[PDB]
């Protein structure tokens, strides 16, 4: 819970504690409370080297003789001398020691290359042996589920997996070889990160068991398997709550970056809960394509557009997003689910843009009933045009919907403009419509809707000759309507 800390001096152990995280964020300096001598529970045995914690209530210590390396355990208490619990007798020497992935038990390594796990009440069970002596290792609970991208909901049982890296820098699974030379590794929920000797940040999604060696390093990934990072930069910490990774540079300054995969996971999670405001902010502030809002689930949007409109009260936000629309599947070119589906495949092969002459077949293919843009426009139009109050709040949205088609209904836009009680408001609408489209065609439509004021008001911005619009209206303004 990040409120208890233990430090070992010689012959005494010191425990410090804080009331809460918020108090530390307020300005309460950490308070030292517990001071426990050595002769109380050990009687001056040789060594005092390491220490570890279990779920805020168990503290483990290593006491080493010439060859025997006992592990002392204490169930914590208050300031008054936390009592001793059974210390075990071990017949080997310990090298490394950590906690487990959820702060429940302890894991440790012997001087031969064997990792074993022990429980908080003297329950012992051996785990694994390593193919080569290592300098670092990490124990992780791999879910034993069967789905390749974990699309199950029964939450099947899990198994303990302990990785490792040698002094030469070769990343190892339990018994699986990985990239030849690396220098770092960090594991969190379903996530593994490691930096090779070429210093590329490479990701691993923990799906299930049966690991295999990773492929030869290649150039570029469409998914988030491979990212380029500065030289000498080892990893420091991972914060998936904000989709961030923090690392240490070689000269001694911090750095923090946000790889695309964890941001995409966050936005997908926000989508699943029918929350269309936080996802918008996340997708915008990190320069993520806005089509992914519902391009990954069209039917949900077709049924939830009525609340999509209500959740986002900013007119400009809606205008931006609807103008931010394309037709392709952003789920297949930018944000493929191959971020975590499949293992041991070929890499991204950084794509190239299409040659221009071979795109026009799609242009000639276009009909209103095929494109996503037209169906989205019709949906939002019929949703908004069912209440005059909503029109008088998103006229800009309606104009954008009209102008977001190949068969643009600019005539309807000018019809909607005509009914305003104001002149400068009509001017603002005219300017907005001129932003998206050429003034020439707008003037053509203004002529085609049989009115005189609108034509000249559009022609003001036409930047054409005075003689283009003087005599035409000077004749039109006078005669009979027929």
């Amino acid at each position: 819970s990040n409120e208890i800390y233990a430090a070992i001096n010689k012959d005494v152990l010191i425990f410090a504690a804080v009331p809460s995280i918020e108090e530390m964020k307020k300005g309460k300096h950490p308070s030292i409370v517990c001071e426990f001598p050595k002769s109380e529970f050990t009687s001056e045995v040789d060594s005092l080297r390491q220490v570890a914690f279990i779920n805020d209530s168990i503290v483990g210590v290593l006491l080493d003789t010439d060859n025997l390396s006992r592990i002392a355990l204490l169930d914590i208490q208050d300031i008054t001398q936390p009592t001793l619990i059974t210390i075990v007798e071990v017949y080997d020497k310990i090298v490394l020691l950590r906690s487990d992935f959820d702060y429940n038990h302890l894991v440790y390594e012997t001087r031969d290359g064997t990792v074993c796990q022990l429980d908080a009440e003297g329950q012992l069970m051996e785990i694994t042996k390593f193919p080569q002596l290592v300098r670092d290792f990490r124990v992780k609970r791999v879910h034993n589920t069967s789905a390749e991208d974990d699309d199950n909901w029964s939450a099947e049982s899990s198994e303990l997996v302990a990785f490792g890296i040698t002094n030469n820098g070769k990343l190892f699974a339990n018994q699986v070889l990985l990239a030849s030379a690396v220098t770092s590794l960090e594991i969190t929920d379903s996530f593994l990160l490691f930096t090779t000797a070429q210093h590329n940040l490479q990701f691993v999604h923990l799906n299930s068991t049966d690991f295999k060696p990773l492929p030869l390093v290649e150039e570029g990934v469409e998914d988030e398997r491979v990212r380029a990072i500065e030289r000498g930069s080892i990893l420091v910490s991972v914060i998936p709550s904000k989709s961030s990774v923090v690392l240490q540079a070689t000269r001694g300054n911090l750095e923090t970056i946000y790889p695309r995969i964890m941001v995409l996971a966050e936005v997908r999670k926000n989508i699943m809960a029918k929350r269309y405001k936080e996802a918008f902010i996340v997708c915008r502030t990190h320069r993520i394509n806005l089509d992914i809002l519902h391009d990954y689930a069209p039917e949900l949007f077709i049924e939830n557009l009525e609340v999509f409109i209500n959740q986002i009260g900013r007119v400009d936000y809606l205008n931006l997003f609807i103008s931010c629309l394309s037709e392709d599947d952003v789920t297949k070119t930018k944000y493929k689910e191959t971020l975590y589906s499949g293992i041991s495949k070929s890499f991204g092969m950084e794509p190239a843009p299409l040659t221009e002459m071979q795109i026009y077949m799609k242009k000639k293919m276009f009909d209103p009933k095929t494109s996503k843009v037209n169906k989205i426009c019709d949906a939002v139009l019929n949703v908004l045009l069912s209440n005059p109050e909503y029109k008088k709040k998103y006229l800009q949205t309606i104009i954008t919907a009209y102008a977001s088609q190949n068969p643009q209904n600019l005539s309807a836009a000018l019809k909607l403009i005509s009914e305003l009680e104001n002149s400068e408001e009509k001017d603002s609408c005219v300017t907005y419509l001129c932003f998206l489209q050429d003034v020439n065609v707008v003037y053509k439509s203004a002529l085609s809707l049989y009115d005189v004021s609108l034509a000249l008001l559009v022609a003001q911005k036409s930047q054409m000759d005075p003689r283009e619009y003087l005599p035409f209206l000077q004749e039109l303004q006078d005669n009979e309507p027929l």
């Binding site: 030469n168 030849s180 030379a181 000797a197 070429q198």
Partner: protein, 269 residues
């Protein structure tokens, strides 16, 4: 910083089963720019064949004396002499008794090759190795060093006769052959050897066609630095691998190497 030296898919430089397969042959071709010398690689090859590991780069060299080992090694050269080979390679501690060393420089020039028919010279220079390898037939490695110089020695010899009289019989008789040479002929500034000096270059091109692996030691570009000496290239030769296993192939990578006090270091850019 330091990186391992791997030259095959089996994560081994010199596979042992190569010596265990009968009815097979293989050829390695090594080229060094004559501003540097590949001796520190010949040593590694010999150690990894005999001791089974690179005993100077990746492994310590405190027990480097492979004399009287179950394996064998045969080296022959023209550029230097028997005296240099013994004194130096024993100061480099390259074995002696489970080993064969051949000179063709000291006292060989003086009317032992000169003013004699060419056919006898070629026959005898072939018979030297044809008799020196009869003892141990299937646990030896043989390396020749810069044999093209002999072309300039024999009165009027082209690439074809020398090749078919010396090189191919040697590889047919022996299991595996390693040929090392230098490439200054391709590095004359503002002069074209393709004008009339193509006879020697024919040998290089023929060897690269016949070779299986190609090792290149080349100097740095425009300038000269302190922390790095040269560049190391590995490439697939012309001929295919004559092994019996199917998954075998060659790894493809480039190294930067520094040499200092017989100690070599390899790493990446």
């Amino acid at each position: 910083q330091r990186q391992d030296l791997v030259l095959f898919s089996d994560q081994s430089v010199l596979p042992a089963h190569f010596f265990q397969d009968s009815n097979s042959h293989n050829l390695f071709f090594i080229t060094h720019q004559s501003c540097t010398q590949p001796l520190w690689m010949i040593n590694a090859l010999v150690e990894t064949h005999v001791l089974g590991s690179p005993s100077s780069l990746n492994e310590s060299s405190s027990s480097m004396l492979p004399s009287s080992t179950r394996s064998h090694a045969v080296l022959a050269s023209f550029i230097h002499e028997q005296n240099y080979f013994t004194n130096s390679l024993n100061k480099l501690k390259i074995p002696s008794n489970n080993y064969n060393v051949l000179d063709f420089l000291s006292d060989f020039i003086v009317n032992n090759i000169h003013n004699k028919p060419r056919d006898k010279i070629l026959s005898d220079v072939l018979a030297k190795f044809s008799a020196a390898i009869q003892n141990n037939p299937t646990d030896t490695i043989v390396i020749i060093e810069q044999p093209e110089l002999l072309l300039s020695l024999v009165s009027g010899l082209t690439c074809s006769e020398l090749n078919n009289k010396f090189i191919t019989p040697l590889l047919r008789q022996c299991k595996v052959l390693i040929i090392v040479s230098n490439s200054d002929i391709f590095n004359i500034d503002e002069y074209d050897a393709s004008v009339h000096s193509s006879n020697l270059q024919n040998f290089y091109k023929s060897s690269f066609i016949k070779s299986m692996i190609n090792l290149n030691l080349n100097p740095l570009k425009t300038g000269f630095a302190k922390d790095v000496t040269g560049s190391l290239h590995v490439c697939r030769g012309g001929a295919p691998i004559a092994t019996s296993n199917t998954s075998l192939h060659v790894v493809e990578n480039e190294y930067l190497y520094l040499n200092e006090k017989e100690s070599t270091k390899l790493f990446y850019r």
